[PDB]
Amino acid sequence: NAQAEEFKKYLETNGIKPKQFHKKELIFNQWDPQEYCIFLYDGITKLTSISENGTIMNLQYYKGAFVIMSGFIDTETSVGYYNLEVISEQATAYVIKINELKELLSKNLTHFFYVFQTLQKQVSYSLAKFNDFSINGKLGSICGQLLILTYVYGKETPDGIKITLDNLTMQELGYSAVSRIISKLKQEKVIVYKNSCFYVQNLDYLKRYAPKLDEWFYLACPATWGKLN
Amino acid sequence: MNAQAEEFKKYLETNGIKPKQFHKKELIFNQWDPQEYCIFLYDGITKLTSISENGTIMNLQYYKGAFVIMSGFIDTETSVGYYNLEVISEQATAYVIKINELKELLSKNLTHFFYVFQTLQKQVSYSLAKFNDFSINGKLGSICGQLLILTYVYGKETPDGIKITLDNLTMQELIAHSSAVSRIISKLKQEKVIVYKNSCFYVQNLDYLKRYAPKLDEWFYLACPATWGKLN
Numbered sequence: 284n285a286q287a288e289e290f291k292k293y294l295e296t297n298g299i300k301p302k303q304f305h306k307k308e309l310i311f312n313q314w315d316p317q318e319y320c321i322f323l324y325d326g327i328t329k330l331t332s333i334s335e336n337g338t339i340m341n342l343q344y345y346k347g348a349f350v351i352m353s354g355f356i357d358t359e360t361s362v363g364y365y366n367l368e369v370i371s372e373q374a375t376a377y378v379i380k381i382n383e384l385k386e387l388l389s390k391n392l393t394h395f396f397y398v399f400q401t402l403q404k405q406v407s408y409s410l411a412k413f414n415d416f417s418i419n420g421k422l423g424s425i426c427g428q429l430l431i432l433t434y435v436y437g438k439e440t441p442d443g444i445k446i447t448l449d450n451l452t453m454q455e456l457g458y459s460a461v462s463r464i465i466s467k468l469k470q471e472k473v474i475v476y477k478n479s480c481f482y483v484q485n486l487d488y489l490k491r492y493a494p495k496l497d498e499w500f501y502l503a504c505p506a507t508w509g510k511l512n
Numbered sequence: 513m514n515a516q517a518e519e520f521k522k523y524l525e526t527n528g529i530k531p532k533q534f535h536k537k538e539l540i541f542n543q544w545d546p547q548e549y550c551i552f553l554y555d556g557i558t559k560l561t562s563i564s565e566n567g568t569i570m571n572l573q574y575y576k577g578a579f580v581i582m583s584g585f586i587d588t589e590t591s592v593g594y595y596n597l598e599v600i601s602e603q604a605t606a607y608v609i610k611i612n613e614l615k616e617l618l619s620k621n622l623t624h625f626f627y628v629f630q631t632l633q634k635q636v637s638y639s640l641a642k643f644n645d646f647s648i649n650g651k652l653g654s655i656c657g658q659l660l661i662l663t664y665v666y667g668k669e670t671p672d673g674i675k676i677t678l679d680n681l682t683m684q685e686l687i688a689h690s691s692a693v694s695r696i697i698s699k700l701k702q703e704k705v706i707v708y709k710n711s712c713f714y715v716q717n718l719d720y721l722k723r724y725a726p727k728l729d730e731w732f733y734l735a736c737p738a739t740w741g742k743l744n
């Protein structure tokens with residue numbers, strides 16, 4: 284994105300430098316009282332919450348470029364006890380103390396608005412996920428996930444749309460009640476695991492069962508969406 | 513009341529924006545309008561709705577004033593989704609600003625920029641907590657969480673329990689008339705978590721709602737700690 288690149292320059296102009304993280308690192312954690320604004324520039328992360336019994340809930344995935352804020356901008360207090368875990372081999376992020384961010388955003392409105400619109404993409408993202416699940420249940424949820432991977436990481440090959448992610452990342456994304464749906468799907472030539480890649484062969488099936496996430500992607504990432512429509 | 517929201521209302525009126533009044537079943541904005549708007553919902557209760565190919569109304573999200581609902585992206589001014597905003601309280605008051613103008617107004621005053629920004633932050637965290645509670649407890653979590661936020665916002669401690677100070681019409685409305693949801697609500701009533709008495713509804717087992725909607729309880733504690741404190 285051009286808006287993302289301009290934001291990166293703005294931060295670096297103000298002496299905020301990128302930090303590199305490796306897989307399994309927490310860019311921020313649920314036990315830290317200081318809250319941060321993360322500009323994830325490159326890599327893939329997941330937002331998790333861990334309960335007192337140790338169970339890890341995967342709430343949301345983010346890939347660069349995107350913005351994730353762990354505290355409220357006005358109060359600087361937590362928005363939820365969440366971690367941001369790196370699941371790609373490496374990730375690059377700019378890590379800004381929440382108070383420090385208020386100062387710099389105030390001197391510039393173009394860059395405020397890039398972060399503002401990122402929140403809007405998350406709200407409508409979450410609502411679309413809910414809408415698709417209400418209509419088509421878990422199949423809808425899973426189709427949406429496959430759909431976004433095709434749009435974001437898909438590559439046209441004679442064998443189909445190759446999901447161009449390191450194999451380790453594919454495992455991190457979930458690849459007994461879930462097991463059966465992916466089985467029916469390959470059983471129906473929607474996906475296949477060949478040449479150590481991942482291929483979608485009926486993209487229309489995914490659109491059918493994830494219509495509102497497809498619309499979300501059309502409305503929020505039209506340029507990406509257009510690659511496969 | 514809500515001090516940060518009252519200042520926003522004054523800031524809008526200082527810039528010449530008048531409030532409009534709406535009545536139940538009206539759409540403040542709709543999914544077919546090419547122009548997108550910023551809604552500052554000042555008073556009343558609303559729901560965000562969509563329509564599928566076959567004409568079924570889907571209830572996606574509820575909002576109550578004071579709050580901000582934006583139908584288009586602030587930068588591109590294009591739709592964030594094919595949504596309608598339907599009034600479900602008897603009446604509602606909202607300020608309706610075209611999206612292109614909101615950008616000017618927030619740029620000239622950063623206190624009020626932050627008020628709208630943090631409304632979005634509350635939406636994001638609310639949805640993640642709703643998702644988390646559904647993941648753990650399914651649809652029971654979603655309903656317990658909905659009743660929990662109603663209790664915190666409209667509840668008043670009484671000897672008969674926490675009275676919900678909302679008209680019974682509005683309160684039954686709040687997939688419409690889903691068989692699955694009706695049975696969950698009536699089970700809570702059967703177990704005396706929420707009861708009908710003397711024309712009002714009283715939550716008598718607040719702990720039960722908190723147990724099954726733990727992440728929305730934390731969300732409310734983090735987002736409105738003073739209101740959370742009143743009933744804890």
Ligand SMILES: CC(C)C[C@H](N)C(=O)O
Nearest residue numbers: 574575576579634635638
């Ligand atoms: C989405 C929620 C944060 C909004 C809330 N229901 C309100 O109107 O206050």
Ligand code: NA
Nearest residue numbers: 311312315353
């Ligand atoms: Na933190």
Ligand code: NA
Nearest residue numbers: 542543544545
């Ligand atoms: Na519209």
